[model samples]
Target chain A: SDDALAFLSERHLAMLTTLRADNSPHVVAVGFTFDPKTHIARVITTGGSQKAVNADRSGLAVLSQVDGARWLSLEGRAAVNSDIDAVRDAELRYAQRYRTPRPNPRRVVIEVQIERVLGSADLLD
Target chain B: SDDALAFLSERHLAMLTTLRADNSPHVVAVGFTFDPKTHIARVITTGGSQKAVNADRSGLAVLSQVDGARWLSLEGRAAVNSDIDAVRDAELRYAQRYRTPRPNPRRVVIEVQIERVLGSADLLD
Candidate 1:
């Protein structure tokens, strides 16, 4: 898990998927932060977007990141947090990993507990 | 569609999404080829994979591509093709765009006929 941690630390766009009411996957390309310290995956998105809407409905989500032959995914319950501090912390972590996101009228952080992780560890080597 | 076609020509990993029976989105990182000639997205995967198994239950799926702030996604019907010719032709097209996939006993082509596409076209510029 040594280099694998570094592998995930790199900025890679992840496709975040949430379940729709009709049992369909709502897929969107999003930037995320995989904090090893907390084992939490953080994402920020427009609060009014469909992604946020679905997150409110159900916290079940998965974030999958891929780079060529190597890939990793975090799947677990997620929550849409609009609390000032929660969103601020998320923004800070995201900025630490990637660039700061542009200001948006509606912004919220989706946090995943990362109950399960799937990846091609061999590809990491 | 001219420039859009060119944008898709370049290789980008697509996170393919399919719905599980319990109405959860099964997300997986996969390679795909967008053929402008036929308007079909080609992906090769194992026949016994959950993706292929889900394809059997339902043909609906989404293939999304992201590069930095720019992204595009194809949403439509998909079929798992085990026909020898379909698999071979898919391999040919996949290799043409990406690279030759090493032969596998479980190889199957997951073909999608894109009905709707969504993305930040301006981001492409």
Candidate 2:
């Protein structure tokens, strides 16, 4: 998964999709981090944001990242974590991938246990 | 909507999301076009592809485009159209935004009649 990891490491924002209760999708742009070894992805957002609420409600989510013709998508069961340790670790990873996210008292981490991976040929290969 | 149109006109890929029958999202990178006047978005793909199947089954779709901190998402009812005229028009739009796509005997247009628009402050404002 080196190719996938390399692409994920690039500084690019992703579109995170979660299903609303009525089966419609609610998507928003997000800055996220992925760990290939653990097959886990993390997105930091307000606990009350629609994405966090939808992920907590449905327990499923997808993060899609694209650059020109190359793209990657990771899908998994998502859970919102407010634990200080979990949030701190997610923040560190986010900093490495994007930037040092501005601090917020309401910040919570959307932890995705990635179980499915989809991508263009270059990424999947 | 001028801001949205201007951002969308830039050459960038987007994530197109359609819900599976079970209410889960199936998202993939796609090259798409939108008409501000008609509030319509178009995506060309093979007729039997998963995206087309999902759109056909659910009649709903979302396209999210992101560039740095700016992002936009368009939601609408989607219909798979195989009409030659529709395909041709979609091809023209696709070419204008991306490039002349490769010929495919199975090409079909997933026409999205956009109903709702979502975005960051810049796009929505």
Candidate 3:
């Protein structure tokens, strides 16, 4: 997690991927905030979105960030936490990185417990 | 296919996603070239990579490209074809965008017959 801290420091867009029923890859652009503190990546999306629903059901997700030749692939067992406090904490961080948004009932935060981190060999330093 | 051509023309790194056996999204940065003529997305990868193997098994893939708020998600029924002509064609196009590379034996081409294209709302001007 050396340069990883610097990597996620920027609010780059991340593409979140989840698996559909037929084992097809479903990927979409998503706004993400990486918590350098916990080494965790948080993606705020609707609970109803395919990504959320798929990950919530399968318990895994991949949030991929790329900047030219340098990229990071974060894979983990993912979960949707609806705890009011958990969502609030995510909202605070989300507001800090990106602008706050209008309310929606499907609001949910994805918690990725990153077990493995992969990236380009040149991502160092 | 409008802004998409412009987007792919940038040589931006794409994250290709395939579904793993456990229903997890296997995503990694990939080099791709889209043929504006044929409307096919070509991804060059070794026949043994997880993406290739997964797609070979599932017959589907999603390539997500993003640059800030501008992004493109190309998805389709995917197939891995190792036919010499297809692989050679992919290599030539890949060398055109990315620098020419050293040789590798496991080479193969991922042909995505893009059945759907999804992206930002303002993608079209």
Candidate 4:
């Protein structure tokens, strides 16, 4: 169940939770694109923001919905990717859903290698 | 700073994370109203939903913002409240911000007793 990538393919938005060095949790609503092939979720956030700072210090928890009342929450470590291709992919996916392209000089693309997924939907049934 | 209630009064939406019995994490976007005096956060969700189930089984993580680039995330145990008065209050608050009243036959009101907050903002400064 933790390895199912179908949910990632259908969900576009994820709420990411990160921990501050002080052990407090930080959550942000973000748009994300998942590559089932790689089983990786990509998120773009402005650099030097609270999210970026958190990602730099610790890891994150990502939550997304596959369908009505059915959702998946993934927990894992994250890395800030400034690579051109990763940024471009994240920007494209974000624009498709939000109808707005990524602003120039974007900060970072957070790549979450999902470690686990928890749900109650028939995905596991 | 961990006990600061300012973040709750300012931000209306919180990304709530819950855990399934298997220990997987489930996350959802929810609108919340915090009572500073009571130090409690109220959230409404349809009955029998995964959130309702998760809240019944475990607790939740609540994330909210204080201002641009400043956010707070809190973690704690949650209890389900289906009281008519509590539901009525949540509906009114929801209507004020989203211009929509709470739907009828609501399932549960999740009350999170915040355990801790994590952030890098000036809340501690």
Clashing pairs in 4: A24-B118, A47-A107, B47-B107
Measured by DockQ, the strongest candidate is 2
Model 2 ranges with Cα > 4 A deviation? none
Report the Cα lDDT for residue B124, model 3. 45
Error of 2 at A65 (Å): 0.6
Candidate 2 all-Cα RMSD: 1.2
Error of 4 at B95 (Å): 18
Q: For residues A5-114, what per-residue lDDT tens digits would candidate 3 score against the true structure?
A: 67776778889887776666678888777776576778878778887888787777888999988899888878898777888888878887887856765688998888
Query: Clash pairs of candidate 2?
Result: none
Which ten residues in a row are the worst by lDDT in model 2 chain A? A97-106
**Highest lDDT model number:** 2
Model 3 segments more than 4 A misplaced: A36-39, A101-106
What shift in Å separates residue A7 of candidate 4 from its native position after superposition? Answer: 5.7
* DockQ of predicted model 2: 0.87
What digit string (tens of lDDT, one per residue) describes model 4 on residues B35-122? 5556676677887788778887766556443233455656666878788887777777666545575367865788888766565456
DockQ order, best first, reads: 2, 3, 1, 4
Q: lDDT tens digits, residues B40-86, model 3? A: 88898878889889889878888889998999888988889899888
Per residue, candidate 2 scores C-alpha lDDT tens digits across A97-120 of 878888886889998999888889
Better of 2 and 4 by TM-score: 2
> Which CAPRI category fits model 1?
medium
RMSD of each: 2.4, 1.2, 2.3, 7.8
lDDT of 1 by residue, A52-117 (tens): 878778878888877766777778888889998888888888888888878765789988888877
